[PDB]
Amino acid sequence: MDIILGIRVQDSVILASSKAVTRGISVLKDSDDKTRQLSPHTLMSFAGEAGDTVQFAEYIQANIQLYSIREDYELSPQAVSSFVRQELAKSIRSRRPYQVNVLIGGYDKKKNKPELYQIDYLGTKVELPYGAHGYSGFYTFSLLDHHYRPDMTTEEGLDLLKLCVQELEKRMPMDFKGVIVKIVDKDGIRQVDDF
Amino acid sequence: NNYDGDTVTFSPTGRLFQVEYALEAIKQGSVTVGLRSNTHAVLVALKRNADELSSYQKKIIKCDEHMGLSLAGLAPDARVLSNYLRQQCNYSSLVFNRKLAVERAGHLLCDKAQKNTQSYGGRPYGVGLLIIGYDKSGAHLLEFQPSGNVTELYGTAIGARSQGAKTYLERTLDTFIKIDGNPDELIKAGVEAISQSLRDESLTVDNLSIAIVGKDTPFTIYDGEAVAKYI
Amino acid sequence: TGYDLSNSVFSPDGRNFQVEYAVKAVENGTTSIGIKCNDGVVFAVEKLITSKLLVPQKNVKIQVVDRHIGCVYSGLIPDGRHLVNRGREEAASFKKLYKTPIPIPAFADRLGQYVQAHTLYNSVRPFGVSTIFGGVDKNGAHLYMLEPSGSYWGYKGAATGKGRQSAKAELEKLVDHHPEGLSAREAVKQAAKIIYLAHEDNKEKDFELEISWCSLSETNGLHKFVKGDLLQEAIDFAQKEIN
Amino acid sequence: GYDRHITIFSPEGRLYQVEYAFKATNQTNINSLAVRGKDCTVVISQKKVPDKLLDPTTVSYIFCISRTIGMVVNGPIPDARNAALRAKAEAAEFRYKYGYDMPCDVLAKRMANLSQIYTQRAYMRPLGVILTFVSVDEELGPSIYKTDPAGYYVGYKATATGPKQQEITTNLENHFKKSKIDHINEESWEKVVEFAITHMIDALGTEFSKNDLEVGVATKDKFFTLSAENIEERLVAIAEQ
Amino acid sequence: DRGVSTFSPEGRLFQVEYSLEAIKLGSTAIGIATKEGVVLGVEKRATSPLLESDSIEKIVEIDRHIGCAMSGLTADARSMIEHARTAAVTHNLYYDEDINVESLTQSVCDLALRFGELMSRPFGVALLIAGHDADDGYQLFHAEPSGTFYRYNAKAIGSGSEGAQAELLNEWHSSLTLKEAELLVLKILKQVMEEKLDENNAQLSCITKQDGFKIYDNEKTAELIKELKEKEAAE
Amino acid sequence: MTDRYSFSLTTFSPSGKLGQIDYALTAVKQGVTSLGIKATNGVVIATEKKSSSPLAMSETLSKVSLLTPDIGAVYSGMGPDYRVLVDKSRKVAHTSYKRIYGEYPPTKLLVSEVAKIMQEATQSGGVRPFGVSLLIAGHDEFNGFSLYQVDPSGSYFPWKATAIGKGSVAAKTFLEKRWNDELELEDAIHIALLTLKESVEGEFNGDTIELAIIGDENPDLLGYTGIPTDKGPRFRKLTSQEINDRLEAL
Amino acid sequence: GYDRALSIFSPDGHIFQVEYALEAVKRGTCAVGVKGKNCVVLGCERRSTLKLQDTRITPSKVSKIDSHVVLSFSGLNADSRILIEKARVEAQSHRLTLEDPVTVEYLTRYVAGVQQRYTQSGGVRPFGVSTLIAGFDPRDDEPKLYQTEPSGIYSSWSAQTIGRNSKTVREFLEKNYDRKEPPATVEECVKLTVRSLLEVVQTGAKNIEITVVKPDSDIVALSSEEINQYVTQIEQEKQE
Amino acid sequence: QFNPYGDNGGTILGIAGEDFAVLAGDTRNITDYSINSRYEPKVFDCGDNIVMSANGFAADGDALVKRFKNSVKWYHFDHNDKKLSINSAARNIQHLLYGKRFFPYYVHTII
Amino acid sequence: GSRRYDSRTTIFSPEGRLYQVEYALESISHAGTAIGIMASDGIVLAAERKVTSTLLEQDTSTEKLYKLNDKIAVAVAGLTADAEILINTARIHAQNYLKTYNEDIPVEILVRRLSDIKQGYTQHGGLRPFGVSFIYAGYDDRYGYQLYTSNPSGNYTGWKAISVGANTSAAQTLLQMDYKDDMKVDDAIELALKTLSKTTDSSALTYDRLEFATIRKGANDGEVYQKIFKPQEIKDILVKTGIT
Ligand SMILES: [Cl-]
Ligand SMILES: [Mg+2]
């Protein structure tokens, strides 16, 4: 766990997430997918304490999937993000809190608008045009301040994202073994295989 | 009649009918005999079978190296009570490094059975027990009834047709009490005692069950070809 | 009606028929007595010898509470044992907190409240025992008798069981003929007589006598059983009086 | 008819178990009386010791609840003692929590509320007793407050309880009609006890020896019961007048 | 009404005696113990022809060395089996060994009387627990809702039990082979069953030391049915 | 031991009646008459003090009770059930309202909390319903003056004026003739006394009648001065002398 | 807590509360399940004494437990919601721990176990509901149809019906359903299901619901007009 | 602050032969530099031809042996007097020890 | 023990019915009639107060119609005290959903949960069921305008128009006759009142014996307004339709 990014463009939300899983002085895996599909048009990436991250992601996934079956209806990205925030807000005052930061990228089918939510382990939710967790933000935010426009296409968003990964690969101390990129739009969730 | 719905109810003449009905389950159960001398204490039990294809229901249970009982009535209730006795014998050993007195064993069973007769919801135990043991004050024989009443005796018997064996022991009292330092003869007297409760059936090799405890004898049970000596 | 089917139900009289039914179980039981004396108390009980097979001296019915209180009862023997077990807990917690051994009146109320609690609910059964008890404390000697209802009073002499009326009559004579008081050793001998006289109401099976006592002088304020020479002396005294 | 066995309403809006608890009150066949002086509150009760084997000193229906509060009970002794022990605990707890001695009327209310709970909740039976509480309260002065199995309670100028309660009640009513006042206009408590005994003798129509009566007296800062000799002295004073 | 754990005047628990009547209504189950193995067989008894009979699971594995057949309110047996399986596996975890067949049966029978006012009523199902261990060898137990269990050389439970038990009395001897015992279960099942016995409405199983507990296929049972009919016609 | 009555003692009969509630209402019918009248500038509640004995001090027994400084309550039915309800009602006003909002609850909401308590006695395990009907009079800043009735079922209704208990049927008819929407508080006290004389049989004076008002603020009854916003309780219990004054000009 | 043993044995060896729960099932609207060669179809009756209904929002008779399994029922409607909810939660819990959706046998076994627990738990009455549970196991093309009942027994069926007049429709299915050759197509299976309901229903208008389940989470509910076409086709062939 | 552990010292030794096995241990018990006993046995016959020692902190060692001896007793009651095999005893002891994983018995155990 | 006095509220009859549920429905059949009518552009709730007294305060009263949130309301028929217990639960449940998801609760979800509570009282716990039937009238962005009903059994169903309480048989026949799918709110208002006016056990239907409420999109642009009618507003609407 370390690098998770998010960019909301005109018609989609793009999430980039690092592939490395390091423990100690060994990179144990270089092909790890740090995300779970919560519903057909909502994707959550995650980063933080080992074990906690996946346990939390899958727990949220199970609850959203349960809701979908019960009501035969997909919950809005705003609604999912609020549910996730409350779970983290409960967690922080527990005996052992979930130390997990997340990005929730979703496409609202009622509004026909992409939405990106950044939530930290304390339960601090913000809707953003672009987001990042951890040290990644210290490079990417200023870069996106400059290059980002609100009316960009998905292809323009991927080039903008490439520009971020290049900067991180140049200046970050750790080898994060590249990223898995996923796009969330009106047609659902798909993975970019060649990045 | 109207006062036998539960154990919490007294009859107009001051009777607890559920306790009396539990007492009736003992009378239906197979006969078992208890007797002792000054050196040894012996249990003799007639085991019962469902049919020729079935096994014979085990009547005697070991509680410690120096104590155990024979049952008559509901076998699962004897298991609950014998397990409680095993724990109390064991608590006495671990905490106080002390073998549990046979008298205290009886007092504990009495108090356990009593609580079931004074509370709503529960029921009385449906079994009678004959406890034998050898402790610091020599050999002992106890008779437990699920009313709570425990009684120390030289000899006794409980179960179906137990009055035959009980009369015999009442006549033989002076003889068998002085069988000291002789296990086989004390068993022989017990086997002859239980024989007075037999009708149509006789004592076979897989039918008879004997147990003994004494001065230099741990509580041991004899079944099968080991009891062929006493037929 | 149906007022007698459930415990804690008042009848139209104002009576708890279940408690009165428990008294019938007490009346069915063997005779037991208590005699207050100069500096202590004496307890005695009738033990019916059902069979030759009963071991003499080894089915003890009188029970001690703490070191200074004696308890005896008539009726359902297990219920009596349950009450003593509670008594011992009540006496233990009193001594734990307040240091001094529990006073007899204090102890009498602890049983009384406990027995009375078993008349308050239908989920429990009343006690099937009347309990005679007492001992010696800082204020001297006390004798008490407690009944299934929770009712208890102090007594000069007390009796319960199948031969209670015979024993009560004999006790009333002792109170009249000894206004200045009865000694401890006398009270043991009288107790034996009164059990032997009260045995006339239960004379199919012969019986075994059991006596205990607390006395400031004779037992140093502690509860003890009467055994050996002193027991046989009391038996002989009782045998001489019946003939 | 299971509505007569537990405390639930009957078709005519009645609680039969409560009514039958009232009948248990007179099971002892004892009459009590309570009156107020200027400085004191006196309570008297009949004492009947039928059995010769009983220790008469331990036969009592008057109780010392706290230093200031006394209580007499009409009803069976087990329920009487049950009520007494609870009242004692309640009075003690009150002092500890709130820093002053529990008033007579407040204890009466508290015991009444407890009695009310038994009339509403099914598992608990009512106690078959009528509790008469007496004190010299530091705010209200001489006080008599009485509780019953229904959970009812009220203050009294004077009161009586028992099988022949009505004869005693009207005897006292006729006195307060005549005197034109709420109390016994008398300086010493000794003469207030003499009044109480005199008016019980007139109402019940029986004479009393020293062992036939039981007397409790409440003064400022203490409640106490009288001994046989204290009553005998009091009986002699009545006889010589 | 009346208490659940109430004794009758004859000295028996009403609810336990009533549960035994439910077990008499159930489908037949037969067990036979030999020196070469223990055989267990049951009547499936489909209520309708549309019901897929292979889904009727009335013979059940507890461990590799212990099997179980049932009769009565079969739904009640699910929690009994669950407990038996856990008890068997748990004992292996604590002691690194197979659990004795008697000790397993005893653990199941402890549940039986844990009812009152714990569960609300006794179980309405009887179990035949068959197994093998190193100490006492091949064993067959009959576990009731009374909390009692008897070891048996052979035993039938269910609606045709009293008729089948009398037949087992004559036919059983101490030198029976496994093949002989298989046929004997099929023979006795065919006698007491309402509908005509075949591979679809009856099921066989066994437990041997070598191969453990095995439920037989419909193809294997069919051949034993055919072998049985030929042998009866042959004299 | 333990409360084994975990089941409802009030259940529906085949006809749809809840028997214990009906029977509780029957107990209210037997009870002594009480009433309440609402005026433009106040509310009055009144009842007869049925003395159990002439030796008993009827002053010590209070049928009309203060719940909050601006809310009062009176009943008909079983007095002990009322006494415990007043205790619980006073407490719930603090726990569920004053300790949260720093102010006393309005009449309608306190009534609602009392109703809740009385409903639970109709459905909870091992209990009978309360054998009382309450009349609660009160004032609050945003609703003004108000008067409510609360029955054993837990149902409550607002009233311009009403009566409950023994002679309620006749008393309600009397109030229908005399009530108008322009009544001043003194006129309502007068009508209350006239209405109550019909139901009372024996003595009729300030010592046998209990009467309280919800009217103007009483700074004299506050106990302190200095805070301008705190102006005192609107609940006032009329004295024995104050009643007798109005009985002369009756 | 309320402890009372409501489900208990009677002298003749019956648990009346369980048997009376079966009477509630018998009162409920008819439900039918028929499984073909490559599908399962669940048919359901809807009583026509209720007009002015809003069929958009009214609870549908067939419920999805997961994307690959469905549950219909007969009996008390309120009771069925509790079973469906529990089953839905267990379906997601199974995905979470085993990383694989439930088999139809496992889901049935769970629901049946819940129903059984309510026949020997203190303070509770049995579920007045029998269920038909149908679907396809993960990565499997063999159709599955199971039945449960208040007692807790469960079993697999080639075809089965429950509810009111179910004995009439079971009689129909017993002769019309061939084990050797089940309904080869979707159309054949739906038709046999509609035919079987037409023995009992009344009219084929807004009284019949049909839900078809196919492999790999392919579930669809038929509309009024689509069902009405089967009703029109069957009646014309009947007149012969 | 209170320290619930102590070191009672000593040493033990187990060797296995073809048809036999030995378990030896010295008889000295110590705390710090003082001798507590010159003869305090810590190798025990537990029944069923199993010998056991739990060396280290003697209070924990005695507690463990006491519990295992008791475990052997209850194995006989629950399983028809069956002989507890050495491998079964070992597995039983693992569960005794691990049962206190988060407040351990400070002992090296050998059977 | 206490077994003797247990009514056994949660059991089946031999016929397979729940005794207490059936008897609770019998109770509700004597309660004042409540009608719900759903139009294309709104919903009407109308209810008849139980035999009013002239001295009852009418303007500051709430017996039949209750607000659950800004978008949902209920009409009550049965025990008011029971209904208020369930209403406060429903109000809370709505705010839990809003707090969790930052969205107003869908109508069916609120109804299901409230109906599930009632169901629990028929299956376990040994307590009597709630003697209440609701008509839920509400709006959400999924299904738009919705009418539901629930009853003591815990069973709920959806409706275009529905009545509960007294004379439902007669009321449902009259609604079934005059109702049509393209209906407006103002027409539904008139139907609701006309139906009560014919089914009423009173001599004549007046303003003081009615509670009335609408849920329109009659606010300014794409938003829902709840109108609980005042006494004077009921008086005017009663004159306007020509009943008085
Ligand atoms: Cl209080
Ligand atoms: Mg943040």
**CA–CA dist B176, B166 (Å, integer):** 13
Within 8 A by CB and 6+ apart from B116, the residues are B7, B122, B123, B124, B125
Kindly state whether E140 is in contact with chain B, defined as any CB-CB distance less than 8 angstroms: no
Within 8 A by CB and 6+ apart from D160, the residues are D31, D32, D33, D34, D168, D169, D172, D203
**If you measure from the C-alpha of residue A136 to the centroid of ligand 2, how many angstroms do you get, rounded to a whole number?**
13
**CA–CA dist I228, E119 (Å, integer):** 51
Q: Is B12 in contact with C21 (Cβ distance < 8 A)?
A: yes
CATH 3.40.50.1980: does it fit domain I1-244? no
Mutate to test the interface with D, among C4, C20, C153 (most CBs of D within 10 A): C153
H/E element holding D19? helix D16-24
Mutate to test the interface with F, among I3, I50, I55 (most CBs of F within 10 A): I55
What single letter denotes the amino acid at residue C107?
Answer: F
The domain segmentation of chain I, as residue ranges, is: 1-244
Q: How far is F40 from chain I (nearest CA, A)?
A: 13
Q: How far is G130 from chain F (nearest CA, A)?
A: 28
**If you measure from the C-alpha of residue F127 to the centroid of ligand 1, how many angstroms do you get, rounded to a whole number?**
18
Query: Of I11, I127, I172, which has the smallest distance from its Cβ to G125's Cβ?
Result: I11
Query: For D4, which residue in chain I has the nearest alpha carbon?
Result: I5
List chains adjacent to chain G, taking adjacency as at least 3 C-beta pairs closer than 8 Å. A, E, F, I
CATH code: domain of residue C168: 3.60.20.10
Question: Which sign does the torsion angle of CA E134, E137, E140, E144 carry?
Answer: negative
- What share of residues in chain I are helix, strand, coil (percent, to 5)? 40, 25, 35
**If you measure from the C-alpha of residue G236 to the centroid of ligand 2, how many angstroms do you get, rounded to a whole number?**
68
Domain that holds residue F117: 1-250
> What token pair was written down for B130?
């004959």
Name residue I162's beta-bridge partners. I36
Q: Cβ of D85: how many Cβ atoms within 10 Å? A: 16
> What token pair was written down for H99?
């049962």
Helix and strand numbers (H, E) in chain G are: 6, 10
Residues from I contacting E (CB-CB < 8 Å) are 3
List chains adjacent to chain B, taking adjacency as at least 3 C-beta pairs closer than 8 Å. C, E, F, H, I
- Specify the residue for token string 């203050």: D155
CATH code: domain of residue E126: 3.60.20.10
Name residue H23's beta-bridge partners. H14
Nearest ligand, CA of residue A102? 2
**CA–CA dist F48, F52 (Å, integer):** 12
Query: Of I3, I122, I158, which has the smallest distance from its Cβ to G57's Cβ?
Result: I158
Mutate to test the interface with H, among E97, E103, E104 (most CBs of H within 10 A): E97
Kindly state whether E76 is in contact with chain G, defined as any CB-CB distance less than 8 angstroms: yes
Angle at E79 between CA E77 and CA E84, to 5 degrees: 90
SS3 G75: strand
The angle that helices B183-194 and B162-176 make with each other, rounded to 10 degrees, is 150
Nearest ligand, CA of residue A132? 2
* Residues F104-133: b if buried by 16+ CB within 10 A, e if exposed: bbbbbebbbbbbbbbbebbbbbbbbbbbbb
Angle at E48 between CA E46 and CA E52, to 5 degrees: 65
> What token pair was written down for B125?
């135990």
Chain C residues with CB inside 8 Å of F2's CB? Answer: 123
Kindly state whether I2 is in contact with chain D, defined as any CB-CB distance less than 8 angstroms: yes
CATH code: domain of residue F235: 3.60.20.10
**CA–CA dist C208, B188 (Å, integer):** 31
What single letter denotes the amino acid at residue G74?
Answer: S
Within 8 A by CB and 6+ apart from G1, the residues are F6, G123
This PDB structure is determined at a resolution in Å of: 2.9
**CA–CA dist E183, E172 (Å, integer):** 12
Q: Is A58 in contact with G96 (Cβ distance < 8 A)?
A: yes
What single letter denotes the amino acid at residue E111?
Answer: L
**If you measure from the C-alpha of residue D218 to the centroid of ligand 1, how many angstroms do you get, rounded to a whole number?**
25
- Specify the residue for token string 């939530």: A119
Per the document, the length of chain G is 240
**Contact call for residues B194 and B30 (beta carbons, < 8 A):** no
Q: What is the DSSP string of chain F?
A: ------SBSS-B-TTS-BHHHHHHHHHHHHSPPEEEEE-SS-EEEEEE---S-SSEETTTS-SSEEEETTEEEEEEE-HHHHHHHHHHHHHHHIIIIIHHHSSPPPHHHHHHHHHHHHHHHHHSBTBPPP-EEEEEEEEETTTEEEEEEE-TTS-EEEBSEEEESTTHHHHHHHHHHH--TT--HHHHHHHHHHHHHHH--S--STTTEEEEEE-S--GGGTS--S-SS----SEEEPPHHHHHHHHHT-
Kindly state whether D98 is in contact with chain F, defined as any CB-CB distance less than 8 angstroms: no
Mutate to test the interface with H, among E90, E94, E110 (most CBs of H within 10 A): E94
**If you measure from the C-alpha of residue A121 to the centroid of ligand 2, how many angstroms do you get, rounded to a whole number?**
8
Kindly state whether F15 is in contact with chain I, defined as any CB-CB distance less than 8 angstroms: yes
CATH number of B1-231: 3.60.20.10
Intra-chain end-to-end CA distance of chain E, in Å: 59
DSSP C218: T
Per the document, the length of chain D is 241
What single letter denotes the amino acid at residue D95?
Answer: R
- Specify the residue for token string 């037969």: E30
Q: Please give the C-alpha separations between residue F14 and each of F155, I23, I31, I83, in angstroms, as whole numbers.
A: 22, 5, 16, 21
**CA–CA dist I182, I178 (Å, integer):** 12
H/E element holding B151? strand B150-152
- Specify the residue for token string 């009852």: I56
Chain I residues with CB inside 8 Å of A75's CB? Answer: 101
**If you measure from the C-alpha of residue A4 to the centroid of ligand 2, how many angstroms do you get, rounded to a whole number?**
13
**CA–CA dist A19, A195 (Å, integer):** 12
Name residue G74's beta-bridge partners. G130
**CA–CA dist D81, C111 (Å, integer):** 12
Q: How many domains does chain C have?
A: 1
Q: How many domains does chain G have?
A: 1
Instruction: Report the Cα B181 to chain-centroid distance in Å.
Output: 23
Angle at G104 between CA G99 and CA G108, to 5 degrees: 110
The pairing of strands E38-43 and E29-33 is antiparallel
Within 8 A by CB and 6+ apart from F11, the residues are F18, F19, I7, I9, I20, I128
Q: Is F176 in contact with I54 (Cβ distance < 8 A)?
A: yes
**CA–CA dist C64, C72 (Å, integer):** 9
**CA–CA dist F210, G139 (Å, integer):** 83
Domain spanning D1-241: CATH superfamily: Aminohydrolase, N-terminal nucleophile (Ntn) domain (3.60.20.10)
Q: Give the residue numbers of C annotated as catalytic, written as ranges.
A: 30
**Contact call for residues A103 and A118 (beta carbons, < 8 A):** yes
Angle at F49 between CA F46 and CA F54, to 5 degrees: 165
Q: What is the DSSP string of I29-40?
A: TTSPPEEEEEET
Q: Cβ of D96: how many Cβ atoms within 10 Å? A: 8
**CA–CA dist A53, A34 (Å, integer):** 9
Nearest to F159 by CA among H12, E132, I57: I57
Q: Is I20 in contact with F12 (Cβ distance < 8 A)?
A: yes
Residues 5-24, chain H: which have Cβ within 8 Å of B? none
Query: For A55, which residue in chain G has the nearest alpha carbon?
Result: G96
> What token pair was written down for G209?
């619901």
List chains adjacent to chain A, taking adjacency as at least 3 C-beta pairs closer than 8 Å. G, I
> What token pair was written down for A70?
């019960």
> What token pair was written down for B77?
């209730």
Nearest to E22 by CA among G18, G23, G156: G18
**Contact call for residues D140 and D78 (beta carbons, < 8 A):** no
Q: Please give the C-alpha separations between residue I199 and each of F15, I31, I38, in angstroms, as whole numbers.
A: 22, 13, 19
- Cite the beta strand spans of chain I per DSSP E: 34-39, 42-48, 65-67, 72-78, 132-140, 144-150, 156-159, 161-164, 210-216, 225-228
> What token pair was written down for I9?
């509220």
Kindly report each contact of residues H10-18 with a partner whose C-beta sits within 8 Å and lies 24 or more positions away, as own/partner.
H10/H42, H10/H55, H11/H55, H12/H42, H12/H43, H12/H53, H12/H55, H12/H108, H12/H110, H14/H53, H14/H110, H14/H111
**CA–CA dist G234, G239 (Å, integer):** 9
Q: Is I1 in contact with C122 (Cβ distance < 8 A)?
A: yes
**Contact call for residues C75 and C28 (beta carbons, < 8 A):** yes
Kindly state whether D78 is in contact with chain C, defined as any CB-CB distance less than 8 angstroms: yes
**Contact call for residues G110 and G147 (beta carbons, < 8 A):** no
> What token pair was written down for F65?
């009770």
Name residue C152's beta-bridge partners. C146
> What token pair was written down for A193?
């295989």
SS3 I92: helix
Chain G residues with CB inside 8 Å of E55's CB? Answer: 146, 155-156
Q: Please give the C-alpha separations between residue C243 and each of C236, C237, C240, in angstroms, as whole numbers.
A: 11, 11, 6
H/E element holding G210? strand G208-214
Query: Of I100, I106, I142, which has the smallest distance from its Cβ to A82's Cβ?
Result: I100
SS3 I19: helix
Domains in chain A: ranges and CATH: 1-195 (3.60.20.10)
SS (H, E, C) B163-182: HHHHHHHHHHHHHHCCCCCC
Domain that holds residue C16: 1-243
Nearest to B146 by CA among I179, A163, C78: C78
**CA–CA dist E101, E207 (Å, integer):** 12
Nearest ligand, CA of residue A124? 2
Within 8 A by CB and 6+ apart from G20, the residues are I11, I12, I13, I14, I15, I16
* Interface size, chain C vs chain F, as Cβ–Cβ contacts under 8 Å: 6
Query: Of A73, A79, A86, which has the smallest distance from its Cβ to I142's Cβ?
Result: A73
List chains adjacent to chain C, taking adjacency as at least 3 C-beta pairs closer than 8 Å. B, D, F, I
Q: How many domains does chain F have?
A: 1
Q: How far is B118 from chain F (nearest CA, A)?
A: 10
Nearest to D174 by CA among F207, F56, F55, F57: F55
CA atoms within 13 A on the CB side of A80: 35
**CA–CA dist B62, B58 (Å, integer):** 11
Nearest ligand, CA of residue A126? 2
Chain F residues with CB inside 8 Å of D6's CB? Answer: 9
Q: How far is G125 from chain F (nearest CA, A)?
A: 14
> What token pair was written down for F150?
């609360």
**CA–CA dist H59, C106 (Å, integer):** 44
Task: Give φ, ψ of I140 to 5 degrees.
Answer: -145, 170
Q: Which residues surround ligand 1, an ion (CB under 5 A)?
A: D 113
The angle that helices C184-198 and C164-177 make with each other, rounded to 10 degrees, is 150
Kindly state whether F1 is in contact with chain B, defined as any CB-CB distance less than 8 angstroms: yes
Q: Is B90 in contact with H70 (Cβ distance < 8 A)?
A: yes
Query: Of I2, I61, I128, which has the smallest distance from its Cβ to F11's Cβ?
Result: I128
Nearest to D144 by CA among D71, D78, D193: D71
The pairing of strands G31-35 and F235-237 is unpaired
CA torsion, ordered G100, G103, G104, G110, to nearest 10 deg: -90
SS (H, E, C) A72-98: CCCCCHHHHHHHHHHHHHHHCCCCCCC
**Contact call for residues F206 and F243 (beta carbons, < 8 A):** yes
> What token pair was written down for G8?
């208990």
Q: Is B121 in contact with I1 (Cβ distance < 8 A)?
A: yes
The domain segmentation of chain B, as residue ranges, is: 1-231
Strand A125-127: give its sheet, edge to edge: A35-39, A42-48, A100-108, A113-119, A125-127
**CA–CA dist I178, I191 (Å, integer):** 8
The pairing of strands A125-127 and A113-119 is antiparallel
> What token pair was written down for D54?
């009983």
**Contact call for residues E5 and E115 (beta carbons, < 8 A):** yes
